């Protein structure tokens with residue numbers, strides 16, 4: 001099909017967090033049917049970033065999801081035309097991130113164009129003070145509403161010292177053409193920063209995602 005067993009990734013993110021503008025470019029690759037991918041990111045403008053890189057990593061494509069053969073795959077069916085998505089991440093004490101991303105295909109690769117806006121983070125909280133250590137593993141509930149696919153996940157943003165804060169994710173996924181709609185299901189996530197330089201100008205992200213009934 002058009003979605004190959006090995007797909008490359010090219011992306012660019014343009015964003016603003018508490019008024020700090022930045023641009024990040026990425027390249028990577030993954031195995032769409034295994035639900036795995038790796039992306040190598042470089043800050044091109046706005047370095048060094050004055051906030052936690054973890055608020056960006058889940059914005060850096062559900063085509064990289066292992067799906068059982070009996071659950072229609074909203075994401076892979078949308079190609080080559082592709083899909084866009086929009087997400088809000090609501091943090092416990094006023095921070096909010098809104099993301100819009102366009103996922104397209106060019107031959108054996110995906111291109112992402114990502115716009116991200118973070119606002120109202122407490123200046124002395126763990127996001128703006130870079131006191132986070134990653135995300136827990138999560139489960140996203142996927143369900144069709146208004147003819148498009150919605151996903152919600154309740155996440156723990158892990159903190160230095162071993163605590164965490166709650167972050168609620170709500171995403172809307174919109175195929176650019178009609179596809180066969182799945183029934184209610186789940187996607188289990190793991191995302192990790194595998195390596196980074198000291199101020200996260202260079203970062204490698206690894207993600208796994210597996211759907212189940």
Ligand SMILES: [Cl-]
Pocket residue numbers: 008108109
């Ligand atoms: Cl390529």
Ligand SMILES: [Zn+2]
Pocket residue numbers: 069
């Ligand atoms: Zn099979």
Ligand SMILES: [Zn+2]
Pocket residue numbers: 008107108109
């Ligand atoms: Zn290629």
Ligand SMILES: [Zn+2]
Pocket residue numbers: 192
């Ligand atoms: Zn690890």
